[PDB]
């Protein structure tokens, strides 16, 4: 009754919009977690402003064609990327959207492959990648996506599993990055990414994030 076998451009737009709203609602929390590389209190603000730049382009130029919608989202992120986290987020989504540029809709396997493509783009963009960060969480989420999509057609079930595994990775970040364990926090960039992913899931279920 509620399975998602294909994601068109409007469903992707909904994922973007609900992910952006969920991040906005949690931006102050994500800011306060920020300790790496400097505790300058801005991860949530940076990611929120970057995501908002993408969301605004999407809201003004919707399409049934997921590839075209992805081009619109990607351009918005890339012209408004703020801070280390916003730049990395924009590169994750640049690679994700490039992977689907020629599609009108995608299935669960192409969704998983697009997460992986985003990870590859983001790691290549960062000259000195550090583990325990948004890169680690994205990498572990994408590996989970590939494994699960191999026998899961339903994108809701797939995204639920991605979130379980992304949360496990996020909770493991202090075991990779010393300052996180010393201060007693998880990685702020990774937390912001989880906020986006949890909005993706709401949209796949046809639900909306309540605006704080
Ligand atoms: N070298 C790096 N490798 C991977 N992720 C990084 C790196 N540097 C920063 N990050 C990510 O960026 C987050 C901090 O984002 P942000 O506060 O926007 O950065 P800044 O304020 O230093 O520009 C970190 O929690 C981490 O997820
Ligand atoms: Mg900063
Ligand atoms: Mg910061």
Swiss-Prot record:
This is Uncharacterized protein SAOUHSC_01193. The chain holds residues 1 to 210 of 548 of the full protein. Residues 10-202 form the DhaL domain. It comes from Staphylococcus aureus (strain NCTC 8325 / PS 47).
């Amino acid at each position: 009754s509620h399975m998602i076998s294909k994601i068109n451009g409007k469903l992707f737009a909904d994922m973007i919009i609900q992910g952006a709203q969920n991040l906005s609602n949690n931006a102050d929390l994500v800011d306060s977690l920020n300790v790496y590389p400097v505790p300058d209190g801005d991860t949530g603000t940076n990611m929120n402003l970057t995501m908002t730049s993408g969301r605004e382009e999407v809201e003004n130029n919707l399409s049934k064609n997921i590839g075209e919608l992805g081009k619109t989202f990607s351009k918005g992120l890339l012209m408004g990327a703020r801070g280390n986290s916003g730049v990395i987020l924009s590169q994750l989504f640049r690679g994700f959207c490039k992977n689907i540029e020629s599609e009108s809709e995608i299935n669960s396997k192409l969704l998983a492959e697009s997460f992986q493509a985003g990870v590859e783009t983001a790691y290549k963009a960062v000259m000195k990648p550090v583990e325990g960060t948004i890169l680690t969480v994205a990498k572990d989420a994408a590996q989970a996506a590939i494994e699960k999509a191999n026998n899961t057609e339903d994108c809701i079930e797939l995204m639920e599993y991605i979130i379980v595994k992304a949360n496990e990775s996020l909770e493991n970040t202090p075991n990779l990055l010393a300052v996180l364990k010393e201060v007693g926090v998880v990685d702020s960039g990774g937390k912001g990414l989880l906020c986006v992913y949890e909005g993706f899931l709401k949209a796949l279920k046809g639900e909306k994030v309540e605006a704080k």
